């Protein structure tokens, strides 16, 4: 089990690095066309990794991020400044969850990220009314 936990931390860091890079590029004024795919793939990878290890609370945060990014990719919602903002907050939150869970070899307590969940659910509802 040492090896899979090591890989969770390493692969997770690469995925979150890619998530953050795409979001920072968008914040700097690069076009969504170049970044929504990489962003989706990074979040999807992070989600799948957490699912492998049964980390359902971590998984649920990544899943809601993926839903929001999917609305942009598939349902014609623009990648507006608010989406970018919420996902940057999500990337920081996921990074803290990664560092903690990798070390506890267990799922996180959801309390600290309930605010993020509310923000994601709110943006999802508002831009897909």
């Amino acid at each position: 089990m040492d090896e899979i936990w090591a890989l969770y931390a390493d692969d997770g860091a690469q995925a979150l690095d890619a998530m953050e890079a795409s979001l920072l590029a968008l914040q700097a004024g690069e076009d969504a066309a170049a970044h929504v795919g990489p962003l989706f793939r990074a979040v999807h990878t992070f989600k799948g990794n957490s699912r492998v290890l049964g980390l359902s609370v971590v998984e649920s945060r990544a899943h809601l991020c993926e839903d929001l990014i999917g609305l942009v990719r598939d349902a014609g919602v623009p990648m507006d400044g608010e989406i970018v903002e919420i996902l940057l907050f999500a990337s920081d939150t996921l990074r803290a969850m990664l560092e903690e869970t990798a070390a506890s070899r267990a799922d996180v307590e959801g309390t600290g990220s309930e605010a993020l969940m509310d923000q994601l659910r709110s943006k999802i509802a508002r831009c897909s009314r």
Binding site: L7, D11, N49, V52, G54
Partner: protein, 129 residues
């Protein structure tokens, strides 16, 4: 014959390790190759003609001329089982698997909510067919 030689093809390193670790516990299958992309899969397969069973991510993009899947289907006698990230029931994955020439499809295992019971059963059914 015994054990059956398995190749795992999935771009997710966590899924390759998880499935490989599980196959270590089956006396009737061993892993002989793992690959993260189509060209690597071709490289390992073309060099390792004793492969009996290929487990292939249904989410992995096909090569532009589908050289890996074509080689596997047309130049080897390996059985091919697609791996799906969602429940197969209610998905398009069972139909997509048949269309691609795969011999079966099964949901990827997880440490979530036994562990590879369905996977082992499917692998065995395929080799006994």
């Amino acid at each position: 014959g015994s054990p059956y030689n398995v190749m795992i093809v999935d771009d997710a390193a966590m899924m390759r390790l998880y499935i490989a670790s599980f196959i270590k516990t089956l006396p009737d299958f061993k892993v002989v190759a793992q690959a993260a992309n189509g060209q690597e899969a071709l490289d390992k397969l073309a060099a390792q003609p004793n492969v009996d069973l290929i487990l292939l991510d249904i989410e992995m993009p096909v090569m532009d001329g589908m050289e890996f899947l074509r080689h596997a289907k047309l130049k080897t006698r390996a059985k091919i089982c697609m791996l799906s990230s969602v429940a197969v029931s209610g998905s398009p994955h069972a139909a997509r698997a048949r269309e691609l020439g795969a011999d079966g499809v099964v949901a990827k295992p997880s440490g979530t909510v036994k562990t590879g019971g369905e996977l082992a059963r499917t692998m065995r059914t395929l080799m006994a067919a």
